[model samples]
Target chain A: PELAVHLQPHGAVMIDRKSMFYFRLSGRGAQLAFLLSKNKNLHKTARIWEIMKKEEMSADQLKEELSAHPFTEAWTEGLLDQPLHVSGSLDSYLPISCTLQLTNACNLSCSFCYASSGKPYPEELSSEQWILVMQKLAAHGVADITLTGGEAKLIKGFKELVVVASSLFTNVNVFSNGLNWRDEEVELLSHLGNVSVQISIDGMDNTHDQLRGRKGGFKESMNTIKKLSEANIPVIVAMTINESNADEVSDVVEQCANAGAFIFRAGKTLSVGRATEGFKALDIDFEEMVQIQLREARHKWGDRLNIIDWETDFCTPGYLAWYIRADGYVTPCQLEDLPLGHILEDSMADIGSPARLLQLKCEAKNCKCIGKIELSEPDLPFQ
Target chain B: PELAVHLQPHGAVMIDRKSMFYFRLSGRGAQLAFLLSKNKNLHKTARIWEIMKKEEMSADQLKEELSAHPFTEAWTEGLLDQPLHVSGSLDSYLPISCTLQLTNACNLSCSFCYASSGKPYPEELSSEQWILVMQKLAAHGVADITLTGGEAKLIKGFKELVVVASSLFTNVNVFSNGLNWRDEEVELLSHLGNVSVQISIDGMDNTHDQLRGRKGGFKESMNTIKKLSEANIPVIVAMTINESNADEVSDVVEQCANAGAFIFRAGKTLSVGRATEGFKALDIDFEEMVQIQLREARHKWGDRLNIIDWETDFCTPGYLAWYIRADGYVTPCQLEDLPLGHILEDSMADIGSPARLLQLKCEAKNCKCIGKIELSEPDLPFQ
Candidate 1:
């Protein structure tokens, strides 16, 4: 039971964890990849596709491909014919991560609050309910959960949720504005393993304050970064690029590095929520400029800080994640309003219903192809 | 990293899942058992107990006991000092089984319905909610789930719940009255792996119909047993022994074996639910009579059918099982009614809070010692 495979829009990736064999395939290899993944047993796969019954046009092509892989050995051993003996059977995709929206209530009123975080949802689950959601995500085989909210620390269950989340998943990241660097919260985070904070600072003090609507937001964020670093907790400094502060992002990234942030991340603001209505003028085609500046920041702070020009567009790969809304509803991706089911009340089998996943994946690809979506770190979760 | 241990009210059981080494200890060995189960590391256990520091009553005895066992080799290997290197660190107990009370809706209206299942509660969770509970139970590392209810098949989502439960856990047994046998349900169950139907038939036709309050329930149950047997599904014929039918249980056992039942199980009726009020008159010290009848049944029918004197008296062991009520509340044992927390709304850590579990274990022990608890198959789950 050593097989693991993933099929994406572009290609498929296969791995035999036992033999440590891997194949990343597209084009000619892609055809065989899909077949092998669909039916894990090589001989059965061949028989089903009729590759062994008689020779055909692509049969020779696939025959050589099979020789290049473990198909020969697997077939000869007469193992996994039932296929369940293999670790994973063929599926459209397996979600590697779940993004948890603990609450939409944010402390700072960012100029472009994409998720429109201001007040907690009336239907927000209790602390224990949130923990159950995290448990379900882990049980669903999700390896990572990136916790976000209006301000996660503002929630009553934030600390408790983190403690449970950290124990269940490999990665527990909190998305914060980095304001009000409190000792108790920092200490709590420091003691837990596999937790990191992503603190957002739109720009340097004057511009950041004007945009974030918090007077000392910039300094507080930097201080948070420094404190997190001092506590040996990984710190990530992030900025949302908009028209007003677009020019100073490099400077902000540089200061983030100086403030002990190991990672400086930046992504363009999305046209959602407040940004769609009040902040349309602030939105820009900022990716090229952001990318160039990230490279420039790299030349200077690259060794000291990991500069990430995160793709700020396109719904997160629906095939790779579920966005758990604060209202207990789940969607395939953050930007999608396709609430498949309520995690607390619905069965996981229904929540990840194949029909909804197919629709979500289809729309995700359509948005990525035609419009405002930039390709993001789709592989990071697996890595 | 292969140790598995379980501590009970009276003793401890340890095993190496890898090496297949096992120890069942009591008396002088019991003194050492507590330390080994508490620390899981021989050296650390010795040091903490001051066994290695000086001459003590247990020091020499423990030294020889250590040499006689694998403890010395484990210590000499210079591994597991902090003990987390081992798979399971010391804990008071580990629950190997969870009983799911799917519904309290019955078809047969038994004279002594222990769970008082006749009508469904308004708070009963959705079909998917039940499946979610199943998933959480499986994720909690429980290996077995015995599904009991008013009549599990009477519930709307019982089939769907079984399908999901069969995939996640190894043992999925349905506790049913075995009346109103349905073809579709039987077919569905026949295809699922690791599922067995435990059908309750109180006595031969006249006694069964009179006690079960149904004119033809006895015949229907026999049909169910034979049908299940024909479909290759394991069948257990269980009877709720009471004053009226304790004499005729032998007849039922013989009938069950003839109807192709593989196991015949009987236990004393408890003073709970309807029995606590309207049917305590039906209750009697039926164990001794039932045990003797079971022995006779073994002599007559044991070749084809196994006889299980299901401990009907003692509450299910808290150390080994959790009885999740229909309302989502979890108790360490069935009879205690000690709702640790609601499975849907509470975090598992708090639900299994040490403070609460300690209380549950205490009460479960008290009930077992003072009154009507019998020692059941304590090792059934592990087996």
Candidate 2:
């Protein structure tokens, strides 16, 4: 009886007692509700005679129609003091992905590398510690773990880490330079059905070699691709678009495709790592890079070449993932090594929790990672 | 010529010279491409007699099919480069909705009121400053501006503020205690055509009166709803569920419906404002509240009542909306008045820009507003 009614274009709607739900009424149903709200006397003591005379409807018909309706029944029941069940639970949040830099040790001198090249970082996480980190990530409901490094394969027990991580996560994506693949190693990787590899290849042959600072590096990588292809391992070729290799991107894509690679990842050079030192000379126009990689490259390749922009693809890096440096420092992304805390020592709840990650800010203005600016705050310690 | 090839179950795919797009091949197309990739000599010279002897196809037939194919032509002339555009914008971030607190004065003292209701604040933004804020917001692409307060109608120039805001924004929403509506005020709002009002009514009669700290608050709001409805103005009834009135949610919904109101907003009591002093006794299980609001209530009264959950609807507050306090200090949301900056002094780009808003983190675990915990970093000034 206390329910409120509002007029809609087609008819009228009413909220049942206790303000729970809204029911739309039309025809006689809508008219009756409107009339009842106007004159309460019509709603009581079978005053249906007045309505029936005005609208030419039988009292029996009105009774039958109103009886079948839930809103009408609810209105009467609540007006007469009927009890209603009130029932709800809290939603929890967690990280979706994690990246473990297995080793900082690298063999290439790629001038733009974020990670220092040619020499390994002085600090390294013990194997026992790495296993613990994998356990912690899985315990926190992390769905994906990316094992990366200067060259992850160069680590002593990298395959073992991949195996352990694969068991814990749905997807284990490894990032590396493909030159170090040996037949036995390829066989080991192939046996782990869930593990997929993304290898870095800057350009084609001489161009790639010049950037990487190894004369026959391109040839070795090509051999590695062939070996990985023969073993039926999934491969994704990653290229960093810089000033020197911008023109040759198409050529490099063709080379990787010929080697039987399925996916190609392209990223505009970020001003981080060693690249930060020489960013001005190396960086290309972001808009131009976007057009070349997304429009021109896509127009030529279609369904066959799946060209993805890595930075854009996983833009909310910290929210979606947590990064653990090789030295056990837990960071939000690859661009920064500012530790949230140590994965091994800190409670994941305290450091890498979705609550904590929500507070992390992104400062990569040039990269324009998705939701980066919206997701970060300024005047924080990191800035 | 240096294109790479990958084998899929259906057939084979290749990238053009620039690794931009993928071209799928089947039947003769697949066979010919595979052969061409294998032997560079066969591709350049097209010595079809050798293929004819081994594969039973005549040189002339093979040559005709291969030459007619677009993939082959694209390989040679780079013209048939059928590209599929991998397209998406940077998804530029901005707040499309804004809430302008008109005044801190109120007639009812709802204990959980985020604005510290019942008494007006000493400081207020000048009318000229408010108008300037609206203009700046319109220029920056804000579509919805909500005029709210301890009670919006209590402000000195509330109606004029609404008129100015309505011109600049697509929608101007007013939030009030609903006890302040007069026939003239309702007529003014109705004439605007673009303005809508949400009036707060915590429960039905006694239950609502107890929480709002005014015995006749519910009755007055009910009459206000009727006046607004008669004037053909949109009205939304809001309720804050707490220990005192959680059971009466359905009753409130019924009242709104009877009053001809269409929109109903219900949020579990948030720990802020005056309510913060006595939060422990009032808090309810969030998930349980969610079920009651989203499931049972929606199922029974969905058509007539549009029940909205404040926490879920605008989870990313900084991304979707900006909140301006009564003094003109801009905040991301109610829980944190950590002013991005003052509206009168800071550049819109400096204070309310998406870049600045993105940096705001939500820390109220109980409220679970957008970016709460996940987007917020730890040990910030507010923390």
Candidate 3:
């Protein structure tokens, strides 16, 4: 079949992953397409949207109305050909994204750092081991790969890992504090077309420097972002919001957009990692932080720049991705540090392990892990 | 640990996958190194090798004598610290190599192709799916990835797969029939530093042309090999020997070696795939092949060119690698196409599934399906 239709209850999403064409049919639009295609689910969707005349709607009219000749032809040919019907549920496939906590070693003394900072993990996967893990991740269908650390840049052979990662994945995103890149490192990232870096710029100088606990380094962060962007690499400016920077979100978005950020990512500080033990005061109310972004930064900058409020969805961490910690343990999400299982000890051969593991580990304890996650979101392009 | 030592009955192999240092200490040497390290295995190796005066040996002497300082120091510091130990068993880690059957389709209708060639599998993994498999292979620690098929060159997006495979693994080896590569395809492969291609050249023009059933393609095969090697890509010239070409093994090896082959490989035609059903007469004795390559070509060209006999060992397939078929099933060996399970249905997480699967499926049925394989061979470098 030329087209892969993922039938959704509301409608259906169709794609030709090879051709890179994507289509989402909502409500009546979806119902109409399925009817035109004479899908088995026609009965299921017949009266769901609105009753349409039987045997009267031509595929030509429906194809144009829905802009779906490919879908129709595929239906006639392939369904008149089991369309490679990608099941509607994502659990039928491997996790789409993976975040590798390459190291717990950091260059900065960020007060709320996750996994702790300033020291290498006692049993960190060596460069070779990480490369192997990356290979496994690639084989398991991880399209988006994130490299982070107490600071990933602090890990030896980080550049090599970045290059290898960019080649294997659809996109390689480096999550960094943006203070430690060398010229060569920036040059390396610039050369890889699908690679991007997300650097934190919590607030203006005094506030950011004070929060990161690195005096006079806010200048370095901003300059690094600018330099990286100038080199033609996408630089995503991110801010971890809290009491000190919540009010400053709009201004920081403006600053980063002017600094040439490809996107602005902002989210509330959490009671996870170092903050769960120390620096707890930096935590802010989730709603307050969301409002600052939604009411302030998002509205002001949404039209001008791509902005991710980061926490709009309450889906569990492993819903769409797996976060592999420094010591080879799997976590559902970066902020949610509960271990699912050791990656080396588990097989990713089965499609739905991460989501299932999330359920087993966090489902009973965390509300977010209760059910399936939405996949029709516009942002999940790879799926 | 500064060192990773894998203890075996005959020897202990050591390596720093990080530093790329590998050592094989046969018999007494391995026992001495273990004794110096005070490993629990010291007692096991004691009587096996000539029992040394254990109490009299000095660390300094043993360090210089066996080139064992890295071992002794790591033992003192890290074992006195639990060395990552990398365990002596290869199963403790993922398979080190994997061969992907990208397609069963071939350009030429070879009568004895293991896969009945010339037509694509009714269902083949799309380019994206193949990419995902490659990623999983990498993540599962497949250090050597081979892009093979009925003729891998016939597959769509062969170049893209090659590039991605090169990036994910330490080395990417492509096995092709060598007659169908485009200039741009050749150029693409040439640029990847750690990639090589094995092109088959069975015999002189007439015999080779007749066996492959493709008229005048013998010339194309030679040209492609020459052009690829000229571009700085290592070319391993190979031959699937049968009654017709067994006598020509010497000439084939010499001809290919002079044509810039990095290695020469020859083996008897297998009783698998199409040969099992038709053209069985083409098969020759395995001992005859070993004699021809070992007794003839090996001694003649061993010093000048690298050569692999392909079937010199009795170790079961899947011992060191996996064979992924066009249908995404796992075969311990290509010649033994009985699938253990669909790779998608199996969990690569557990370390030793393939070997164990082999034991359950073929152990009672086949003599070759036996326990643990020897890994200290020089060619098993990555492990």
Candidate 4:
């Protein structure tokens, strides 16, 4: 926010490669010192002093040089490429990712189940195949891949499925109930690569009752974390942000940090079956996630905590999360799972369906998707 | 500088934690929001923040809670034990370091020689003696060691000297004319250790003429850069800043940065035999080393370059250069050769009166020695 170089209010300072400041911009004036720590090259550093003018040093001899600004070129220069658009919104021209779940089928039921709540199984990922439809989304060049299901860990060779998605990916992180990883299995899966794990946790106590509907759920998940950490693996503490456990987010982060987990994140309860089954238990007032996570993370973990609001309902459209299912299906989003295309559909050819995903992108009519990692969580029919 | 958090001027944020912010020092005004990053964990994240705001923050906080401002215990904790103040005229705590002149001999006699630009046979350290001194320093937990000479490269077993020095120190750097480093030597030297090189060149071609005395000294130094870069070595351009070439300091930086040898530094002409010999060529009023290095380094390099000044009348005496001569005698400061002790003098028991050098710690009479790095740099000539 301060000038890089010392310049009297009315004095001049170098603004871009070609120009210098003439008249200075006052703290409250139309002039703003826009600093972007991007590209870290001359252009970005020079841009701050670009549009500035010293109030007393006016439009006389230096006006011609002072008139030029790199405002347009700076934005266009692929410089604001990081998610650091601290302006409270993620830039859309750049790729932002979210998880898109198409179905809820699974082979194994984890004891610590937020999905099943340790109950009976549910039908998922039908052969009717939205894989092709989802695969068509390569057009958007979505940068992240999130594949979620009953037991994504148990989804036959799901590890490879995510690895096949190593391309067009910024970071491929997963959320799982942790029912599938054994000590060695984690070590083996550790190398398959790009994916980071977010293990679903109910609480530290009897997980079966609190989460998996069983007594040993908590113990089993703890074992899973031991395996993950031993394999030099990182896991995010995936807690469902709900009213019943709203206060526990702080404790969860402290627990995870102490356990050496990389991060603690929350999955907002959606308004849908199973996923939204706990909606009533955790539905928050609009944007409360922002306030709450910021509250807990800063107050508790401070710098150690990183709260990624992965399931924001009102996030900017076109910022869709690309879900790559085990069946080679690539869905544009995890919420509705509108399969845009599939790797199987064009296994022999180069698949470029991201463009189509961009084109079909539509606003979440009934949902709110406002800022960073913002997107629609399923809204269930309420009483 | 604005408060990002809420706190009454005299209010303490963590009332529960004894650590309080005594905002009303001298009874100031009311408090408002004592801001936090709003993005992170407060406790751990604020640890280093406390060290930073120690002057104003109150460290004694809630019983066990670590305060943002650590109390007296910090000094007791030996965290402040790392620094050893040297006496210098500038009111700044110039970063302390040791320089060992292995031998005041040179392979190349460049005209601009502050070390007398001569290719003369000088006192050199024997292999056994050098090892003994280096080992003692390593044992003493010296932070860094710099090896220089009339031309360190000209010292009789120079390469071997570096190897032994590297083994005995954590941060080992070298200052050289660099003209003697041919491709193979450059390649070998680059890989020898965790070392940084400082190669002197006053300016471009003509400006370097009278200073370097050698006809093509400028080109030789510039040529050394290519070998350095090709060898994946970083070269610090040590350009002595005299009034004559002062205007070109910025240009020297630009040229060095453009040539991929970015560590450009400037030093004022010292009031010494060699510097006074070149006095007419010397620039502005001279003062302490910190003042000299700080003005140029901060102004020119921002944060990229670090300036370690050489040849000052009054250096904060304590950790000034540990001067090792060609004959295996290590002295404490660059200007000393009285050899309070030598490696052989102790018969492998550790020589060199680091304490006698301490006696040289006469609070540098001329320099103000304010002791704050940031505020001290420009305040020169012992106020």
Candidate 5:
């Protein structure tokens, strides 16, 4: 779990603090770097001797290029140094994005919802206050924001927020079930240049309706997609692959593409909300999810459908993004519901800093976020 | 430099990478905590004995209170665990803002200009490419974007970039010398909401002109501010407090307010570009800067002026904000010219990751960024 360094014969992948990037190496560069990474006690002189002996190189020749060797130099310079946590230094941490739960109230309760039991919270931010939060986030230099809810459509001033946030942020990703897609709202979203609407559609017709608990849900969602596509607005069909419809994922992808959907996002059901009871049984392992979502679907509709392997599967709650609850309290994630601070009360800087976001201990094993699997486990060897 | 815990007599400030929050403590709570912080090997029993002996408290009574102490409890829960660096697992790092240099061409050749020489670069992004960059940044979830340049107004697609970015991001902060501001551009900026213009003014007149190398530069800037203010546009007076104009900083702040500017931001000149030749002489120490900017200026314009102490002085170059050169290369800071990647070529995720941001060795000693000072120093005992 502590391993951040991934070594291959020709190159290496280094995952450091929410970022993964590959670097090219040559000859026994990977082996030498791996050796140096493991043996931290040795001096560069000692490291050079070991590498020279291993590579059958003369001392002078090895020494000439040794200091300039990318991986070896990086090791000596402490670039490969691994730390278990971040230091509490000033401005050392910054949240990548923030998610605002517009309203706790929802129209339909899904079996695997992570929020509350489809009930409206008594207290909610005023429309002005919602705009204020967007302003504050913008002023605080927050890069990305996601507008969500039990369903964002249920909230008053959802449109106002979208308009204001459209002007303020680089990306505004709205999460909703297509059950509430209205013409006026679609028109407003269409005109607003860079907004992406992700409508939840679990499986094909019967399976989707069963999960959403609404009749004609599939037809309604498809209609919404058609309207969005007609207006040249990109739509992402969000599917939560569970035991009930995991086998029918291919069908779902095909239907999504046929409905003029731009992207098909699939994710396993997380065990935080209504799915708390026996979600384990409902859950599909990453291997199966990966096979269906990535390999099988990509192979079939590689030309037509842009398939994103897992939706919201990455462990970004406390790192890349923070969750703003309806009541104005901020949490890293619903699973780790420890309140980092009240957005209305705390300075955005204080709330968004690693000083705050990194407080909650993430239960990686129980997390349904797909990125956590890779985060929790070391990178697979080589390819 | 690994100290993250801050203990006081009645309360404590715990600055962990994961969290930064305050908690209440009692009696010799601060003292006891400080002692424990210095001595790493001791158990709670040993710590308690030392605390009791030092504070001249009865062992039984002190021990009882110690069990109930907030600091003690927090420590037991591993809240104060310090690490050398940020963890690489999961999504742990995020950039708060991105600055796009619209052009490397400037009308004025300020002695302390951080960008390139006053000449425009041979190859620049077309208007379409600039819009593409903004769209990419918005999609990538960048919150705030600063459209800057040698002089942004001089660029071909400067106005277009501003318009697109104003809609794309939550906050659009633009940097200019104000000498090139036109009526049409001013009208455009005024109509667009949530955009702040940070016009550089080193001093009142003589000092400003001397630095910017334009005869009527100061007058033009003041006029520009007046025009913007008349149009209800927000203007931020940006002052580079160097040896040439340090004494006139107060006057500059006054004029900024009188000009109906929204905010007055002052920062020390970084040693880059034109300032590289003699920045050492012009540099003001942090203590002096704090005294002049925070203590002195705040004392004068407490209410009317929204005085920001050092705009980007806080240590956020690699963490909260990234610098995109005029040619599309990305760097953590202008001073550290090591490119993470080209914005047009590499993925935004790679450009904004800790793996890329953390590659540069921060020179905490000469850094004007305030956050670096605390990071460079170890925690003092009981201070």
Candidate 6:
């Protein structure tokens, strides 16, 4: 026995551990948020954010609830005791929330619209009601609030909505078609708190305008973006790609990055609502666009922008965000008309405790945009 | 504009990081070897031995060599791109080194010992040239040698000495008990090698007595620690504490944790030598009585027997160490002589390399026992 021994000299010793919890949707973002929260040193906040972000939970209402409660008040005395464990690399998400359907009405009718149907059907809530809901959610602690609509800018008090929200929340953003957003509108947007506007562009010039059923819609959007940026109001481009426009994903992302939009969110048609109108596979070019977009995002953003794509259903709250109808009804899940509750007579605190709210899971079958990115890392790094 | 903005909300932000490292000398017994080595998982080592320890960088010999040639020949192409910096706490140290010494003389002469002047001269080296030195220092690329003497009983063959000098020429240690360890007896002792030793004792045992002056002279040196633990051998009781029997240093330490020893190094004595000679202030009351017999040596031999009073300079070698003497002699610091090196025609590589020898610097200084009672943080868990 030259150098033989009863025991082996080189082998790794490993111990397996239970994951503790599995998340709905993709869990990647939630896992990330939990990990980052642990890393962010905002342990208490990270734990709460982790739960809320998962389950594609509706948090617009929760934010308003916390703001109303006051800082460190008895109302939040023990709100941070929830067990939120984080021990992995899935903790680098800093999500930018989108609250589409700020209002159910739009100024123009775009034939291929999923957000706003060109058809007239109005009984939408006023700017005041939308502002109230935004405030309540901010109070409850929603850092960012994105205002979306059939065309968010077409909503009567859209400007006021962005202004009030920006003033009260950490960040106020909007996703919209710029049909009603003119140079003057850009000027107003510039004064509306520190709001960031994300405008929809189906594709470049003619192609985008063609889908929206307006000859100049694309032009107006680009002009609005430029004006907003010139006024120091940051703008992000959110492109919805269908069979006809998917080929232009790279161009749009490039344009967004070059234009200093900071971030972008693009997606495939959900096969819901008006957009469900017979469409061919040629419009998507699915695989190619997905590959192209992912490459561009990583190269351009590095570790900055928060990119959201169509197939990323079980990862972000892109579709799971709250959608307030023209009426006072609050739709927890956008893309559908199911009213979970209303903000007019309901306070999130009155409905559920922080823990209970976190437990309020979504029942969206076949849907997956719940969460994946974590807001913080448990045992997060100090600055 | 109705409500003027006055209050700015406060939030918790990450700030900084804090940690410590050191070494431990007692407990865990044999199982401690793996953890104490420089190659062990330092993070784990730091976590386990985080208190009541010493810092690396105390060995003046290592400090100089590592500062120069941080890497070696064989490992040159692999990891020699940059200087190997063994910085941070002991847990942060690199691993795997086996260059040590073990040899201190016997027949017990009492005075002239390093710590108190009450221990006798043992012997010196007579080993071969370079083979022994390279064999031991080969692992760490040792550039320095710790020469220990008085009882390097196995150096007469010149086998160890021939090995050290031919491999990696660096420093040499020669800590002696100061008797027959003369320059002429071992001609290799006066060479310009990196050799040095600290000699000691209590006084003359008559002035100091067989307490340190003779062979088998217990009746006269009865109050002296028989078979006394010195810079050689691992025993707890020493002349510094055994004034009559063993001084009541335990009580003194309990009363004032910073109390000095009753003899040479009663309290915080540095510079690696005896503090005084006449020793008028060193005598103790009847309460302090130690019998010169085998019963005393056998009884005080575990982790619990805390009899001797050591200082920063004397205890700096830390746990798990090696001390080489002048004839290329060696031992674990001044505690005992274990021949691991020789001067004349030996090469260091035959015993050990300079890099491996340098790792002994862990806890060679920054003694925690000499100062404040920290929350207890050790970088290295070994000596």
Q: In model 6, how large is the Cα lDDT of residue B135?
A: 30
lDDT of 2: 0.58
Off by over 4 Å in 5: A1-89, A282-290, A310-315, A353-358, A362-383, B1-383
Q: Across residues B1-383, which tens digit of lDDT does each residue of candidate 6 receive?
A: 00001100111111001101112322222112222221133332333222212233232333242334332111212322211111111111111112333344443433434433223225433343233334333222233344333344234543234223311222344433434433222322222212233233333333234445455332222222221222122211133434432443333222211221112223322234342343334333422332222224324431334434232122223222334444345333443333334433433222333333334333233223312222223221111
DockQ metric, candidate 6: 0.01
lDDT against the true structure, each candidate: 0.62, 0.58, 0.60, 0.43, 0.60, 0.38
RMSD (Å) of each candidate, 1 decimal: 13.8, 23.7, 16.5, 23.8, 24.1, 26.7
Give each model's clash number: 6, 52, 15, 94, 22, 209
> Comparing to the true complex, what docking class would candidate 1 get?
incorrect
Cα lDDT tens digits for candidate 4, B306-368: 445444222233333345556656444454434545544542112323344334444332122
Complex DockQ per candidate: 0.03, 0.01, 0.03, 0.01, 0.02, 0.01
- CAPRI docking class of candidate 4: incorrect
Identify the candidate with maximal lDDT.
1
Runs of candidate 2 with Cα error greater than 4 angstroms are A1-93, A281-300, A309-315, A353-359, A362-383, B1-383
Report how far off residue B252 is in candidate 2 (Å). 49
Q: Which consecutive 10 residues in model 5 chain A have the weakest lDDT in total?
A: A83-92
Which residue ranges in model 6 land beyond 4 Å of their true spot?
A1-100, A119-121, A279-285, A293-321, A347-367, A370-383, B1-383
Residue A279 accuracy (lDDT) in model 6: 47
Per residue, candidate 2 scores C-alpha lDDT tens digits across B1-383 of 22433222223344332222445445355434433332222332144323222344544555566668665754344332221101000122334568888778787776677778667678787655676567556533455678887787787766556655654455678887877576657765665556678888887898888877787888998999878877777889877777667667766777787787868887666677887885864444644654575556667777876877544233246544678888888777866676677877765445645445445653323324645434322111000
Q: In angstroms, give how far residue B114 of model 5 lies from its true place.
A: 28
Tell me the deviation in Å of residue B87 in model 4. Answer: 22
* Model 6 lDDT tens row, A48-93: 3333233332234334433453431211333222222111111111
